[PDB]
Design an enzyme around this catalytic site. Structure first.
Site, PDB file in Angstrom:
ATOM      1  N   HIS A  47      40.263  37.361  39.433  1.00 48.03           N
ATOM      2  CA  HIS A  47      41.715  37.204  39.270  1.00 48.03           C
ATOM      3  C   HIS A  47      42.080  35.773  38.909  1.00 48.03           C
ATOM      4  CE1 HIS A  47      45.859  36.853  41.128  1.00 48.03           C
ATOM      5  NE2 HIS A  47      46.017  37.739  40.152  1.00 48.03           N
ATOM      6  N   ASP A  89      47.345  40.735  37.615  1.00 50.64           N
ATOM      7  CA  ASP A  89      47.745  41.131  38.970  1.00 50.64           C
ATOM      8  C   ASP A  89      47.420  42.587  39.243  1.00 50.64           C
ATOM      9  OD1 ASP A  89      48.631  38.561  39.306  1.00 50.64           O
ATOM     10  OD2 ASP A  89      50.736  38.991  39.132  1.00 50.64           O
TER      11      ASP A  89
END
Ligand SMILES: O=C(/C=C/c1ccc(O)c(O)c1)O[C@H](Cc1ccc(O)c(O)c1)C(=O)O
Lengths: 122, 122
Positions: A47, A89
């Site tokens: 991420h 996300d």
């Protein structure tokens, strides 16, 4: 933004996102990256690398909208940063869900993040 | 470096430094600055602003020499930046010692660091 990220994590994992992931391992939440402790941590590593690919986006502040279709997150913004942040996300929320079964509370409040071994380059 | 800082914190406060301050409040330990929550946190705010002023050395990584004799810290001056770095660390260790009386364990693992209100610019 943080608010959307937290909500996605909450909606995919069922966990309180800041409490469960805000200081987890060497990569989740506050701070930077480091050698991943486990699969959950590797989700956060990926991420952060996803965010790093972006130029001129503010992953913390840039607010975007997302929706649900067939219990899947839909990132429909036209603004390139908003679309890309949303996709980062979405991916981490999905990854954290996929790896829920190996979530280890021992890693949850990692006050030794600065001593994590250096992460590989993204 | 973090090693000298932790040593000073343990010398001055008697607390395990990473466990006690590595995620405390909006300013201690990992992460950036934010509105201080209490006096301990404000020590940390001042510390991180002190680091920001430095020129010519790396507060995370660079080792430096200090003495602990008669429970007093003396910073070496072989290098002017490391002297200032040492003084940043000395000041936070003392400040933390002096505010132990209001140390709040509810702030010890602040997984809400990214939601801290914007810190005063240094
Ligand atoms: O609502 C906020 C923060 C608002 C805020 C205030 C200042 C900021 O700079 C900022 O980025 C956000 O704090 C928390 C929000 C929160 C988010 C995710 C969680 O998993 C959680 O338990 C609480 C609270 O309700 O106490």
């Amino acid at each position: 933004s943080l608010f959307e990220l937290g909500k996605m994590i909450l909606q995919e994992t069922g966990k309180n996102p800041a409490k469960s992931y805000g200081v987890y391992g060497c990569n989740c939440g506050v701070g930077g990256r480091g050698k991943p402790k486990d699969a959950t941590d590797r989700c956060c590593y990926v991420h952060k690398c996803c965010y790093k690919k972006l130029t001129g986006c503010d992953p913390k502040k840039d607010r975007y909208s997302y929706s649900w279709k067939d219990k899947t997150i839909v990132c429909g913004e036209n603004n390139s940063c908003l679309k890309e942040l949303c996709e980062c996300d979405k991916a981490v929320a999905i990854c954290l869900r996929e790896n829920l079964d190996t979530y280890n509370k021992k890693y949850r409040y990692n006050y030794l993040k600065p001593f994590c071994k250096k992460a590989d380059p993204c």
